[PDB]
């Protein structure tokens, strides 16, 4: 996976690749990993096997899923954690003494309030210019960093360039590219 | 095991091999891994040792076992998870940070509503053309992909060809082949 | 251990060896692993160290220990699981994602209702001709398979031949042989 | 440790060595591992570090510590398990699927009712002639087996010979030898 | 990370580097690891991924976050442990038999009451001259020890020198340096 | 990688995908790198891209002493490849008899007018009647080729393409474009 | 694999299954690949299919210097097989005395007019009086042959078939058809 | 650490070294590991990181901390275990099947009632002449054993000699030596 | 480390960061230590700082016998480097064919008027058309150079600088200042 | 161990602690054991006390053939030390290029009128401009020396003492007394 | 095992326990097996009883070429012991410089009129001023001897006895009776 979020000027963008697999076996589809949730867009980290519950949970919430500030995203995903446990019987533990782990990344978020990342359903970050997640994200970060200050490139174009870089070098990332842009409030 | 599901035109099909073992020792029988549940057919993944409880649970449910839509299959297997714990004292945990694991696959499903797969009793997928599970599934996927667009082949015939491929190359798959077809609503 | 069950004609049989050990050290006795439970015979898998509680539990049950059908054996051993936990404070967990393990085998059963095997106190199987368990069972299965269709051999004789094979080749199986026969209802 | 129990004629005996250590460091004393409990004698298996609670528990019980039959010893040590958990906050788990382990041995017992062994606070055995436990027990078993049928040797003398053998060959067994004899009822 | 605390004369100081990472990937920022909590300064140990909850918890407490004595810091962080569990569903276990582990370090603290360190949310230390934590702390300790008795250097200057040493030699420490000083009561 | 060989009628074929990587990082490339013309044979290389240059240089440099049209010839030729690797390039290729089957011991598939062959551990040579495949996508390829081999409208080249297509469809370590070469049997 | 040898009366027999695989993937084949005629003896090969070609080529190429009709002859012959593997084919077959029993050290079973034999680690040779078997299905085979050996209506060939049948019945790594050869004792 | 207790004549003594570390890094101090608790002295085993809670707990108890007999010490430290769990949320588990482990040692104790050692907060020992704990204790035991019968040496002098030996040979033991003596009742 | 090579138009470039460490402890230094002038080529060294001195001493001492302007020349030259390491400096550099891709087998990148090259395990030599990079920050560098390569205002030197900048930005084991050298193609 | 070398102005210094152990058990000693006079140089030995006697005997016995006043001389000298260890004392000192940085490969620090040096794996020699340190207490020492190096009142000897003091203060495997030797640069 | 050596005044002593085992099983014995008279020296052997016979046979057979009265003599003698073990008895005794301290590398303690010595890995020889000990009970022994060494009424023999007594008291792998030999210094 290569998923990125970008912020520049009065616009934000979220970009993602399309590859979905059950382990090493590719699954052909009719984008599955980027979800519209109200007027936000959420890009899911991790294995395809865990997408259906997350899509069903976030899209079903509706009004109680508030994402336009860091505190709102934080309180919302605390509620996502509780719903996973009580309704779907899924565990999402966090221990403070654990080091950084990629499998604890939940999602990136883009809306008119800004661009955000969620770690372990509890730790929420806000980003000023860009960030990315998944197996192709290091390639994406280098690309977006190299081109961000170009005057002819908006947030959507920078996000596309980020995903292109991930697809170019990562075997676990593949075309087509899905990009959505949103104007800041 | 090689178990497949196929959808083409106004018909769906489910196909499975017959090999059942306790570990490395083969068990001779009078098909054990494909179960009629109401008007659906369910193909069980995993070891033969865990078949009896699953067969007893699914066939005993009756009316509360609804499988003709993705949401119905989802809610039904959430109930299967609870029954396993409360009635049969069997555990089926899911952690979100876990990667893809073959031992979390529950079953494939075929009925007049379509063809489905269930992962970890919670994550439900719908398939457009075909899918397969078990040790011989990679051979089966290649075979079904190669022949799906043949105008002379219906869903039942494609499923047979899928199971044939699994039997040909996988030591843990064996004849005879069991195939059932159902007309879409 | 080599323990077998056989069914042929109007008779069933259960056969077992006599070797009992605490680890690698042999224990001399005055058969310990085959138990009469009402009008059934139960052959215990696993270490000698866990025999006393199982013998005490099964023989103490009496009327609530019903074993003449697959469903009865199933419900009975669900109750055995609960008694082990609540009365004797012993754990018998099952996880669905676990593969086949020999240490989960509980027993073989022979009575006028047929011949049965119990796995993990929850999964119950019925056998048509024969089966065996323990370290010498592969030798036993080969022997019984080779001689089953002999017109001069009844169920008791086939079971003896099964245990003989286990004793011949397995260091963890030893004479004398204990065989009991029961007429089918 | 080398601890043995013997039964012959109208007498039983229990024998033990004297070595006590905290790990590899020897502890000099004013026998610590053989305990008088009412009119029985109990020989403790395992590390010296766990002796004080066991001595305090068994000797404090008094009348509710009944040991003269297999069933009595069984029910008594079920109560010992509960007291360890509820009063002393010590765990003694048993899983049925576990293999034989020396660290699950609790004690040998000798009284006018016979000679007994307790495994995992739940599984109780009765012995006809002799048995032994601890690091020197294999040497002891060979010695007692070789001399048991000697007409000039009683149960006490056979037990001494058993402990002598353990002391001779096992570095974790040491003199002096402690032997107690009891007449059968 | 290199974070230090210093006490000398009528002044204390806290010093920290600026490097923040998600694993091996650096995160560019607009100091994130040093937090003003009332009139104290708290420097956070461990991964950047766990900063947001800790910052949100400590700054939200307000009056119930008392830090000017060893006992106050102790009782306050016991409450931090409970809030993490009950409000944020985060675990912070301590076992007494565990050895020293760097991942159990919580923070260093500097205020008008003195300089403190917190280990595992339960064990609180007070320091007379200085201490440091994180991957560059050994370099920092050597530097501060070498220069502490210099008559021209106050607590703030000694802390800067400590962080400089960490930045010089540790790849996981980077400029700019953040230092805050506070007068003792 | 998905590489296949096929034999049907008077024709044989060899097919391969194009993906080449240094570990997990893709390398953009130029004609197919893993299928090599060696005289009038075609050789498809198994394993990591990092070990391709020496193998390409060795096989193409041999010329006349690289004889591949029979099982025995392929066998003796690759014994010589083993010796050259050790003595000229200082590379080790050990075989122990007690070792089990390992995919990292696969060397190559071969197609020429003498037939279709596979080489394991530079010493064990097999001949195939209808088809075979190697690499991470080969199980998908085998299922596809098995399912379509008896089709009267499909020749050896077409069956090989279908094999590589299946590997590309399902294996993340296999990618288009597909390279196929056909040769008439002698 | 299930391979057995039997001796009874004036006849010996060798029996084997037909399943051959590259790892977990089955290879379709042609006559039985794992039983080899070597002069007037029959040799049944243990272990992975990947190591069959060199062993077949070595044993069948020896000819006159491959003498197998006594325990000492089989012993000296397979010492020479060990040396040829190392010097000609550059394959290692080490033995350490302190190693325990390992199934991957089994080389073959042998049947000829001199008797029935087994070879372990190319150095340790055994002679059998009634029967033995090797491979993943051998425990089932041993039980079957033991149960039926004393039947007056069954000769060595029939007992061997029954042994292989038992292996095929219960072992997933054993498959039909069954190959049996009988030889009269000298 | 080297901590010892000695008993001779009408006097007992407790001796300890001064080295305190956070892992491999030494901490300079203004003795931290020997605590006065009422009229007893308690020497703490294990890492410096766990000292503050133990010091705070034992010194805060006061009258309910009774230590002058084996049974009193036993009941007192059972209460210490409960307080650690309920007040400080610290775990101190004991399993009976565990072997001897140095990390389960709690403390040595010296008072007018005698000299004691506590293992796993539950198992209490009394010593006749001497004992020691920590990384330098083997050197200390050899020294004290060699000199105990010297007529010119009292309990305090023997304890000093014990700690001297630990300091001489153990890198994790360091001067100065702290010794306290108490007259037996 | 972040080291890159670039080729565009009539120019090539090599770029590297400056960070050098003994393990986790930084060493302050002097000109760039990891980029070496060897005749009229520039060589960027992969791996730990601890192994730089012998490699610098060996390559710069060779002189005329160190020929690097073609793939074959670089190949033969580094075969000789392998032999010198063993015979003169008593250092081992083994390669086994069955080993997978490993980053610790990377030797160097090379830039000269003949083109841009990479050397793996002293034996496997690659030529690059546009760019490549090695070391802990190379993935960031590859993404940056790929994103900007087709810019008409950027030459090979500028693209290399941008590559190293990206590595320094995100990798803790890469640090300023940046060292870049450009060479005109023959 | 804490051993340091310093260079400042016209003087160099070498400093070391005194702690020597067989494993965890301290050995009481006599002058400093880990700093050796070799001609007019001083050599500070890294690693376990158990390996000191052979190294002391070898270096002090060499005499004239032990030349240490330049980087190349130190390099050639310790290549000879490696050969003597193998041929005379039957001790192995292997280096593999693909190995990462390891503290157990550190041999010694050196101080003489030619400068201050460090030797890694008997083959890789470094020269230092201001200071360096080795052993378990070296990180504390580096921080101390870095913090005080630019003090106008401190010479090379005083900076080295301060370095060893820091190691002794914080490292349990470092202990007083401190041994320091100074030498004037040529 | 507890074995010690002591030096005080004009006398040295060597002391040892008597316990000998094959693994965990005790072997009953005869005079002390682990202390050997070699000419006019006494040698106490470390390690398992299983390796005593060759060492006893080698050292006692040497005679005149076994010189032990100085550190250099002991050193050269045990270099020769290493060579004899390899060439005559086919036993390996490797040393790698990068290895840490290991108790299984201890060879022996030595006492004679020249002083008291210890040998590590057949190559590293130490001389002791007051005392030392080896084996599983040595830490107890060191503490005892340290505590009593300065007693005016105790000679070297008495201090050694006290050392072995301490080992026997606390170590399960040490047992009575105690064997002590004293020798006057030259």
From TrEMBL, chains A, B, C, D, E, H:
Listed CDD domains: proteasome_protease_HslV
Keyword terms of this UniProt record: Proteasome
GO cellular component entries: proteasome core complex
One of the protein's GO biological processes: proteolysis involved in protein catabolic process
Pfam families from the UniProt entry: Proteasome
Protein's recorded name: 20S proteasome, A and B subunits
